[PDB]
């Protein structure tokens, strides 16, 4: 994992904005601004909190490493996603309307762009039918 760790370190350094090696919220905000999303302070705080191992308002390098470590496509993670999907799925089946899904993506939550939604749809619905299998999609992910 040496190469991976080096990469992570590099990433951290570019993020950090200082020689202290301790990520404040301010640094994160700056980074976000550089991208151009323009996030709220509360949001930033929330982001840091999840990451933070010590729970002291500052992301340590070990903390960062820990967050990197826990991988997606773990079964526990998948369950939550499935539950979420179910929440939007009428008719209590592994099936949702494609158009409806698109609409939801456009509107509810952290809004997703039209192109992105189209891409998602393409990824999901291999068949021409709009009734898309969310379970399958989740598995693929």
């Amino acid at each position: 994992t040496e190469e991976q760790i080096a990469e992570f370190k590099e990433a951290f350094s570019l993020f950090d904005k200082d020689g202290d090696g301790t990520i404040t919220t301010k640094e994160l905000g700056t980074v976000m601004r550089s991208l151009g999303q323009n996030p709220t302070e509360a949001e930033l705080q929330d982001m840091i909190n999840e990451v933070d191992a010590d729970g002291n308002g500052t992301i340590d390098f070990p903390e960062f490493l820990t967050m990197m470590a826990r991988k997606m496509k773990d079964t526990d993670s998948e369950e939550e996603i499935r539950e979420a999907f179910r929440v939007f799925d009428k008719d209590g089946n592994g099936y949702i309307s494609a158009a409806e899904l698109r609409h939801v993506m456009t509107n509810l939550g952290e809004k997703l762009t039209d192109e992105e939604v189209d891409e998602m749809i393409r990824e999901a619905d291999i068949d021409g039918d709009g009734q898309v299998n969310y379970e399958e999609f989740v598995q693929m992910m």
Binding site: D46, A84, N93, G109, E135, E136
Partner: protein
Amino acid sequence: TNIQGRVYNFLERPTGWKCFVYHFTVFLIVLICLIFSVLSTIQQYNNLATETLFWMEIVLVVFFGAEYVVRLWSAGCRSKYVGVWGRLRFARKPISVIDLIVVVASVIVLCVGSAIRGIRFLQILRMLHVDRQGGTWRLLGSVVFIHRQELITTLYIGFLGLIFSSYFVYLAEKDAIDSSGEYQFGSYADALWWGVVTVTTIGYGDKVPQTWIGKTIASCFSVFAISFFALPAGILGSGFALKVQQKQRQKHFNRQIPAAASLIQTAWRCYAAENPDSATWKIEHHRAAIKVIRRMQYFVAKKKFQQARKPYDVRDVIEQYSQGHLNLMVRIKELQRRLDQSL
């Protein structure tokens, strides 16, 4: 057409009136069958009932088979169970398996046949059919899991006490013959049995400590042991009550939606992140940073979703307050800055 789905709904996971009625009827039939079996079991009503059982039981089994077939057919409603493999998976589920066992066994019995030994057992098994979707058992299981740490302890300590008490009673009442002319505690097994009875609080009275010392020991070791044995019933009940209370103050279902959506979106973003020339790369170092940010967002989203799923709590309130307060502070700071800037 939506007919398959409807059928599925009717059969498994029904909230329908008609469906409910059907289920009730089935249950009643099962009960009647059980009663008939019981009647047959006693010698006075054996000759009259057998023929009736033969007439009816076959019909019942046929009906159940038909029902099973229908259920299997209906599995296609759920995308979890599609094709042959899906159907097999569905069948694998416990209740379905049980049903299958019942039907095949019944068929075998019929083939063998109008006396039948296993038919009684099959009848008994049948009563389990009505608890569809595992809605009865599952809740109970969950509760047990929640309160396992304590429950297990209670089982253990109580058991130990029972053992000890039994031993002591054996020691006491080995030599002492009863008034009827038979040794009540000849074996340690007998003593153990007695102890079990006593702790249970059944009190058959086939065995009772004869010696005064034995009686004293029983008096000593009863009460505590009794309490311990009653504990599971109490504790589980309490847990159930607590669960009910929690349910009573649940969140509204509309609050779960947006969080869920957000989570989904974040997951999608994360997925995209791996694909280099995708549409989600809109709005090397920078890319890396973005990936990290997306992951962070996903993590946040998951947490939010979890919170939404959970019931209302003091922790949630505190979190809300914190969120509000920080925002307010920021606003105040901004105002201050503006004031300073002007001057």
